[PDB]
Ligand code: NA
Protein backbone atom coordinates (compact mmCIF):
# COMPACT_ATOMS: atom_id res chain seq x y z
CA UNK A 1 0.00 0.00 0.00
CA UNK A 2 2.43 2.67 1.25
CA UNK A 3 5.24 0.70 -0.38
CA UNK A 4 4.02 2.35 -3.58
CA UNK A 5 4.40 5.78 -1.97
CA UNK A 6 7.96 4.93 -0.94
CA UNK A 7 8.72 3.98 -4.54
CA UNK A 8 7.13 7.17 -5.90
CA UNK A 9 9.32 9.24 -3.63
CA UNK A 10 12.41 7.32 -4.84
CA UNK A 11 11.33 7.95 -8.42
CA UNK A 12 10.99 11.67 -7.65
CA UNK A 13 14.43 11.72 -6.06
CA UNK A 14 16.07 10.03 -9.05
CA UNK A 15 14.46 12.70 -11.25
CA UNK A 16 15.99 15.35 -9.01
CA UNK A 17 19.40 13.70 -8.82
CA UNK A 18 19.71 13.15 -12.55
CA UNK A 19 19.26 16.93 -12.89
CA UNK A 20 22.46 17.32 -10.84
CA UNK A 21 24.61 15.16 -13.13
CA UNK A 22 27.58 16.92 -14.71
CA UNK A 23 26.43 16.91 -18.33
CA UNK A 24 29.98 17.47 -19.57
CA UNK A 25 30.97 14.15 -18.07
CA UNK A 26 28.02 11.74 -18.02
CA UNK A 27 25.44 12.98 -20.51
CA UNK A 28 24.69 9.48 -21.82
CA UNK A 29 23.80 8.02 -18.42
CA UNK A 30 21.73 11.15 -17.74
CA UNK A 31 19.98 10.55 -21.06
CA UNK A 32 19.10 6.94 -20.22
CA UNK A 33 17.51 7.98 -16.95
CA UNK A 34 15.82 11.05 -18.38
CA UNK A 35 14.21 9.17 -21.26
CA UNK A 36 13.12 6.40 -18.89
CA UNK A 37 14.93 3.46 -20.48
CA UNK A 38 14.95 0.23 -18.54
CA UNK A 39 18.15 -1.70 -17.85
CA UNK A 40 17.36 -4.08 -20.75
CA UNK A 41 16.89 -1.10 -23.07
CA UNK A 42 20.03 0.64 -21.90
CA UNK A 43 22.02 -2.54 -22.41
CA UNK A 44 20.50 -3.01 -25.88
CA UNK A 45 21.80 0.41 -26.91
CA UNK A 46 25.32 -0.51 -25.78
CA UNK A 47 25.17 -3.82 -27.67
CA UNK A 48 24.31 -1.93 -30.87
CA UNK A 49 27.32 0.33 -30.26
CA UNK A 50 29.49 -2.73 -29.51
CA UNK A 51 28.55 -4.47 -32.77
CA UNK A 52 28.81 -1.42 -35.00
CA UNK A 53 32.17 -0.54 -33.40
CA UNK A 54 33.38 -4.08 -34.06
CA UNK A 55 32.08 -3.86 -37.66
CA UNK A 56 33.88 -0.54 -38.07
CA UNK A 57 37.21 -1.97 -36.89
CA UNK A 58 36.73 -5.00 -39.17
CA UNK A 59 35.95 -2.86 -42.23
CA UNK A 60 38.92 -0.58 -41.53
CA UNK A 61 41.18 -3.68 -41.40
CA UNK A 62 39.75 -4.71 -44.77
CA UNK A 63 40.69 -1.37 -46.34
CA UNK A 64 37.29 0.36 -46.24
CA UNK A 65 37.59 4.14 -45.72
CA UNK A 66 33.92 5.19 -45.78
CA UNK A 67 31.32 3.81 -43.39
CA UNK A 68 28.15 5.82 -44.01
CA UNK A 69 26.02 2.71 -43.88
CA UNK A 70 26.94 2.17 -40.20
CA UNK A 71 25.10 5.37 -39.18
CA UNK A 72 21.97 4.36 -41.08
CA UNK A 73 22.03 0.95 -39.32
CA UNK A 74 22.51 2.70 -35.97
CA UNK A 75 19.59 5.06 -36.66
CA UNK A 76 17.45 2.15 -37.83
CA UNK A 77 17.83 0.10 -34.66
CA UNK A 78 18.30 2.74 -31.93
CA UNK A 79 15.51 2.75 -29.31
CA UNK A 80 12.83 5.14 -30.61
CA UNK A 81 12.64 6.93 -27.27
CA UNK A 82 16.07 8.34 -28.12
CA UNK A 83 17.11 10.94 -30.66
CA UNK A 84 20.01 9.87 -32.90
CA UNK A 85 21.97 13.13 -32.77
CA UNK A 86 21.46 13.51 -29.07
CA UNK A 87 22.49 9.96 -28.26
CA UNK A 88 25.62 10.10 -30.40
CA UNK A 89 26.84 13.36 -28.91
CA UNK A 90 26.09 12.11 -25.39
CA UNK A 91 28.00 8.84 -25.94
CA UNK A 92 30.81 10.84 -27.51
CA UNK A 93 31.03 13.36 -24.65
CA UNK A 94 30.92 10.66 -22.02
CA UNK A 95 33.95 9.12 -23.73
CA UNK A 96 32.19 5.97 -24.96
CA UNK A 97 32.68 4.22 -28.33
CA UNK A 98 35.06 6.96 -29.46
CA UNK A 99 36.00 5.46 -32.82
CA UNK A 100 32.42 4.82 -33.89
CA UNK A 101 31.10 8.15 -32.56
CA UNK A 102 33.76 10.17 -34.37
CA UNK A 103 32.80 8.38 -37.58
CA UNK A 104 29.09 9.09 -36.96
CA UNK A 105 29.83 12.75 -36.16
CA UNK A 106 31.83 12.95 -39.39
CA UNK A 107 28.99 11.45 -41.41
CA UNK A 108 26.41 13.82 -39.90
CA UNK A 109 28.66 16.74 -40.65
CA UNK A 110 28.64 15.72 -44.34
CA UNK A 111 24.89 15.24 -44.62
CA UNK A 112 23.46 17.70 -42.10
CA UNK B 113 7.26 -9.44 1.23
CA UNK B 114 10.96 -8.83 0.50
CA UNK B 115 10.19 -5.88 -1.74
CA UNK B 116 10.48 -3.81 1.43
CA UNK B 117 14.17 -4.66 1.78
CA UNK B 118 15.07 -3.74 -1.79
CA UNK B 119 13.28 -0.41 -1.32
CA UNK B 120 15.03 0.22 2.02
CA UNK B 121 18.33 -0.30 0.25
CA UNK B 122 17.39 2.23 -2.47
CA UNK B 123 16.39 4.71 0.24
CA UNK B 124 19.79 4.27 1.87
CA UNK B 125 21.50 4.80 -1.51
CA UNK B 126 19.55 8.00 -2.25
CA UNK B 127 20.66 9.23 1.20
CA UNK B 128 24.28 8.54 0.27
CA UNK B 129 23.97 10.02 -3.18
CA UNK B 130 22.37 13.31 -2.05
CA UNK B 131 25.44 13.80 0.16
CA UNK B 132 27.52 13.75 -3.04
CA UNK B 133 25.61 16.62 -4.66
CA UNK B 134 27.62 19.75 -5.50
CA UNK B 135 26.09 22.13 -2.95
CA UNK B 136 27.26 25.18 -4.91
CA UNK B 137 25.09 24.11 -7.82
CA UNK B 138 22.08 22.14 -6.61
CA UNK B 139 21.50 22.94 -2.91
CA UNK B 140 17.74 23.21 -3.39
CA UNK B 141 17.28 19.76 -4.94
CA UNK B 142 19.57 18.45 -2.19
CA UNK B 143 17.36 20.13 0.43
CA UNK B 144 14.14 18.56 -0.92
CA UNK B 145 15.68 15.10 -0.73
CA UNK B 146 17.40 15.68 2.60
CA UNK B 147 14.20 16.92 4.26
CA UNK B 148 12.22 14.03 2.76
CA UNK B 149 9.70 16.06 0.79
CA UNK B 150 7.39 14.19 -1.54
CA UNK B 151 6.95 15.12 -5.18
CA UNK B 152 3.67 16.88 -4.34
CA UNK B 153 5.41 18.86 -1.57
CA UNK B 154 8.38 19.84 -3.74
CA UNK B 155 6.03 21.00 -6.48
CA UNK B 156 3.92 22.97 -3.96
CA UNK B 157 7.06 24.89 -2.97
CA UNK B 158 7.79 25.77 -6.61
CA UNK B 159 4.20 26.90 -7.05
CA UNK B 160 4.55 29.37 -4.11
CA UNK B 161 7.72 30.73 -5.73
CA UNK B 162 5.94 30.97 -9.10
CA UNK B 163 3.05 32.99 -7.71
CA UNK B 164 5.12 35.32 -5.52
CA UNK B 165 7.51 35.86 -8.44
CA UNK B 166 4.59 36.78 -10.63
CA UNK B 167 3.12 39.05 -7.93
CA UNK B 168 6.52 40.71 -7.61
CA UNK B 169 6.74 41.28 -11.37
CA UNK B 170 3.20 42.69 -11.34
CA UNK B 171 3.83 45.04 -8.41
CA UNK B 172 7.07 46.29 -10.03
CA UNK B 173 5.14 47.05 -13.22
CA UNK B 174 2.60 48.98 -11.13
CA UNK B 175 5.32 51.15 -9.58
CA UNK B 176 5.83 49.48 -6.19
CA UNK B 177 9.42 49.56 -4.92
CA UNK B 178 9.07 47.75 -1.59
CA UNK B 179 7.69 44.20 -1.33
CA UNK B 180 8.31 43.20 2.29
CA UNK B 181 4.94 41.52 2.55
CA UNK B 182 5.94 38.94 -0.08
CA UNK B 183 8.49 37.45 2.34
CA UNK B 184 5.88 37.18 5.12
CA UNK B 185 3.50 35.42 2.68
CA UNK B 186 6.33 33.04 1.63
CA UNK B 187 7.26 32.29 5.23
CA UNK B 188 3.64 31.70 6.16
CA UNK B 189 2.94 29.12 3.43
CA UNK B 190 6.31 27.37 3.06
CA UNK B 191 6.28 23.69 4.03
CA UNK B 192 6.95 23.33 7.79
CA UNK B 193 9.72 20.82 7.10
CA UNK B 194 11.81 23.61 5.59
CA UNK B 195 13.63 26.57 7.08
CA UNK B 196 12.83 29.89 5.38
CA UNK B 197 16.42 31.19 5.30
CA UNK B 198 17.88 27.87 4.21
CA UNK B 199 15.31 27.39 1.44
CA UNK B 200 15.74 30.91 0.08
CA UNK B 201 19.50 30.67 -0.02
CA UNK B 202 19.28 27.22 -1.63
CA UNK B 203 16.86 28.43 -4.32
CA UNK B 204 19.08 31.45 -4.88
CA UNK B 205 22.34 29.49 -5.16
CA UNK B 206 20.77 26.98 -7.54
CA UNK B 207 19.78 29.92 -9.76
CA UNK B 208 16.03 29.60 -9.31
CA UNK B 209 13.51 32.49 -8.91
CA UNK B 210 16.37 34.98 -8.98
CA UNK B 211 14.28 38.15 -8.89
CA UNK B 212 12.13 36.99 -5.98
CA UNK B 213 15.06 35.53 -4.06
CA UNK B 214 17.16 38.70 -4.34
CA UNK B 215 14.18 40.66 -2.99
CA UNK B 216 13.81 38.15 -0.13
CA UNK B 217 17.52 38.28 0.65
CA UNK B 218 17.30 42.08 0.69
CA UNK B 219 14.33 42.08 3.08
CA UNK B 220 16.16 39.68 5.38
CA UNK B 221 19.21 41.91 5.47
CA UNK B 222 17.01 44.80 6.68
CA UNK B 223 15.29 42.79 9.40
CA UNK B 224 17.68 40.07 10.55
CA UNK C 225 5.86 -2.78 -8.17
CA UNK C 226 8.82 -5.08 -8.88
CA UNK C 227 9.55 -3.50 -12.27
CA UNK C 228 9.56 0.00 -10.81
CA UNK C 229 12.07 -1.07 -8.18
CA UNK C 230 14.24 -2.77 -10.82
CA UNK C 231 14.38 0.41 -12.83
CA UNK C 232 15.38 2.43 -9.73
CA UNK C 233 18.10 -0.13 -8.99
CA UNK C 234 19.37 0.36 -12.52
CA UNK C 235 19.27 4.15 -12.19
CA UNK C 236 21.17 4.06 -8.89
CA UNK C 237 23.79 1.88 -10.68
CA UNK C 238 24.04 4.54 -13.38
CA UNK C 239 24.12 7.46 -10.92
CA UNK C 240 26.84 5.99 -8.70
CA UNK C 241 29.01 5.90 -11.84
CA UNK C 242 28.64 9.70 -12.03
CA UNK C 243 30.02 10.27 -8.54
CA UNK C 244 33.20 12.34 -8.28
CA UNK C 245 35.61 9.64 -7.08
CA UNK C 246 38.04 12.27 -5.80
CA UNK C 247 35.41 13.45 -3.36
CA UNK C 248 33.07 10.58 -2.39
CA UNK C 249 34.78 7.29 -3.23
CA UNK C 250 33.65 5.65 0.02
CA UNK C 251 29.95 6.29 -0.53
CA UNK C 252 30.43 5.15 -4.12
CA UNK C 253 32.06 2.00 -2.75
CA UNK C 254 29.13 1.17 -0.43
CA UNK C 255 26.66 1.45 -3.28
CA UNK C 256 28.83 -0.37 -5.82
CA UNK C 257 29.45 -3.32 -3.50
CA UNK C 258 25.77 -3.53 -2.58
CA UNK C 259 26.02 -3.00 1.15
CA UNK C 260 22.80 -2.45 3.06
CA UNK C 261 22.31 0.47 5.44
CA UNK C 262 23.08 -1.79 8.40
CA UNK C 263 26.27 -2.98 6.72
CA UNK C 264 27.31 0.56 5.85
CA UNK C 265 26.68 1.68 9.42
CA UNK C 266 28.61 -1.29 10.83
CA UNK C 267 31.68 -0.22 8.83
CA UNK C 268 31.52 3.30 10.31
CA UNK C 269 31.13 1.85 13.79
CA UNK C 270 34.36 -0.17 13.39
CA UNK C 271 36.12 3.03 12.26
CA UNK C 272 34.62 4.95 15.19
CA UNK C 273 35.88 2.45 17.74
CA UNK C 274 39.35 1.98 16.30
CA UNK C 275 39.67 5.81 15.95
CA UNK C 276 38.75 6.14 19.59
CA UNK C 277 41.13 3.32 20.50
CA UNK C 278 43.87 5.05 18.53
CA UNK C 279 43.28 8.41 20.31
CA UNK C 280 43.28 6.57 23.64
CA UNK C 281 46.55 4.73 22.97
CA UNK C 282 48.21 7.92 21.71
CA UNK C 283 47.22 9.61 25.00
CA UNK C 284 48.76 6.72 26.93
CA UNK C 285 52.07 7.16 25.11
CA UNK C 286 51.87 4.40 22.47
CA UNK C 287 53.60 5.28 19.20
CA UNK C 288 52.93 2.14 17.09
CA UNK C 289 49.45 0.85 16.38
CA UNK C 290 49.98 -2.03 13.87
CA UNK C 291 47.48 -4.21 15.70
CA UNK C 292 44.64 -1.75 14.90
CA UNK C 293 44.91 -2.47 11.16
CA UNK C 294 44.79 -6.22 11.87
CA UNK C 295 41.62 -5.70 13.94
CA UNK C 296 40.13 -3.63 11.12
CA UNK C 297 40.92 -6.25 8.45
CA UNK C 298 39.50 -8.93 10.72
CA UNK C 299 36.08 -7.34 11.21
CA UNK C 300 35.57 -5.42 7.97
CA UNK C 301 32.65 -6.63 5.81
CA UNK C 302 33.92 -9.41 3.51
CA UNK C 303 32.31 -7.73 0.52
CA UNK C 304 34.96 -5.00 0.84
CA UNK C 305 38.69 -5.00 0.12
CA UNK C 306 40.80 -3.58 2.99
CA UNK C 307 43.10 -1.39 0.86
CA UNK C 308 40.29 -0.13 -1.28
CA UNK C 309 38.09 0.80 1.69
CA UNK C 310 40.89 2.57 3.57
CA UNK C 311 41.89 4.66 0.57
CA UNK C 312 38.23 5.50 -0.16
CA UNK C 313 37.61 6.55 3.48
CA UNK C 314 40.87 8.55 3.44
CA UNK C 315 40.11 10.30 0.13
CA UNK C 316 36.58 11.21 1.21
CA UNK C 317 38.04 12.88 4.33
CA UNK C 318 36.70 10.39 6.87
CA UNK C 319 38.52 9.12 9.98
CA UNK C 320 41.62 11.02 8.93
CA UNK C 321 43.74 10.07 11.94
CA UNK C 322 42.99 6.36 11.75
CA UNK C 323 43.37 6.16 7.96
CA UNK C 324 46.76 7.85 7.99
CA UNK C 325 47.93 5.32 10.56
CA UNK C 326 46.55 2.49 8.39
CA UNK C 327 48.19 3.87 5.24
CA UNK C 328 51.48 4.12 7.14
CA UNK C 329 51.22 0.54 8.35
CA UNK C 330 50.48 -0.70 4.84
CA UNK C 331 53.48 1.17 3.48
CA UNK C 332 55.68 -0.69 5.95
CA UNK C 333 54.32 -4.13 5.16
CA UNK C 334 53.12 -4.02 1.57
NA1 NA D 1 13.52 -0.38 -36.58
Ligand code: NA
Nearest residue numbers: 187188189190
Ligand atom coordinates in the same frame (compact mmCIF):
# COMPACT_ATOMS: atom_id res chain seq x y z
NA1 NA E 1 0.41 28.25 7.34
Ligand code: NA
Nearest residue numbers: 297298299300
Ligand atom coordinates in the same frame (compact mmCIF):
# COMPACT_ATOMS: atom_id res chain seq x y z
NA1 NA F 1 35.88 -12.07 11.05
Ligand SMILES: [Zn+2]
Nearest residue numbers: 050051052054
Ligand atom coordinates in the same frame (compact mmCIF):
# COMPACT_ATOMS: atom_id res chain seq x y z
ZN1 LIG G 1 30.47 -8.10 -30.40
Ligand SMILES: [Zn+2]
Nearest residue numbers: 162163164166
Ligand atom coordinates in the same frame (compact mmCIF):
# COMPACT_ATOMS: atom_id res chain seq x y z
ZN1 LIG H 1 1.25 31.63 -11.89
Ligand SMILES: [Zn+2]
Nearest residue numbers: 272273274276
Ligand atom coordinates in the same frame (compact mmCIF):
# COMPACT_ATOMS: atom_id res chain seq x y z
ZN1 LIG I 1 32.71 4.85 20.35
